[PDB]
Amino acid sequence: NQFYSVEVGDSTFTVLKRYQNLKPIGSGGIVCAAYDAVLDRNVAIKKLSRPFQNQTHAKRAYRELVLMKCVNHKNIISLLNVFTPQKTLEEFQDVYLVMELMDANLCQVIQMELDHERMSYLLYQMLCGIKHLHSAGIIHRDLKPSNIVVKSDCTLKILDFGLARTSFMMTPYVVTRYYRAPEVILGMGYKENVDIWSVGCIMGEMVRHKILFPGRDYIDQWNKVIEQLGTPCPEFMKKLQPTVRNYVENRPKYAGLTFPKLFPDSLFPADSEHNKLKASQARDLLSKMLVIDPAKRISVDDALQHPYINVWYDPAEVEAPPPQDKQLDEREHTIEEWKELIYKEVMN
């Protein structure tokens, strides 16, 4: 048998014999660190249990399997291996995904104090990933630090591909909503720079070491947004559904704090002239990203050319090739049907 099983937490991991020494690293997909004897290197292994179990699990598992293939960029996840220990479609239960192991998630990194060099390099890489996604026709809409990983050398990868076209799940785990753009919160149409919002949230948490827009749900969250950024102006409301527009115009109204107030000099390295200049530059970029109205929010291409960001700028990394299904995102199936779609993709 080419497989063996081991208990990793209260999960069984049945994996190819090449992967040894499974240490758990993730939960909520369960994720392990292992050593790959064939490649003589460390890897992350993630187990999807019955990913065909419902539409939500299935749409995501399937979509991200196929989207893996038409994407190739150092700032986006790529798989080393995909396998199932089960021998037939009938017996099929689990998919395991393998990638090169990384050192930390972005949550852990946000907790640290970081110089402008590492901070701006992280942000540059997020923009490169997002640009590559956009160039392939993928608007993420759901970036969060928990799905971003870093190596010690500050290299970065995005691990998921966001939302599709919902959506109920009987699990006790919560969806993190804090990085979603106003237009996602308020059910608007969106464009590429929806993902710029998420980046500002992350950048801002890196400075503040505190989630920018928290809340039980979108009600609390929207309050957190207008009380810091202030009520959006008339022409923003005009693009809201008449029902959403009513509720938004009827909330307590705010002037909104300035960006020096939101992010004082005290939060920044500002001990040399270099850092004083970078502080101003960081704040200026934040002020252009954390913009409620997407018509005035900065684009990915403009953010890449921002002074804070452009010191890293590489044509290789920015204007990388956009390769390579179609009706993916809009498809609707049953358990039986998603099981086979998934099995086919795991087996090729």
Ligand SMILES: COc1cc2c(cc1Cl)C(c1cccc(Br)c1)=NCC2
């Ligand atoms: C610290 O290293 C990691 C930590 C995690 C993950 C990947 C890596 Cl490389 C994944 C992940 C995500 C997709 C596929 C695979 Br394989 C792994 N999820 C969150 C924890």
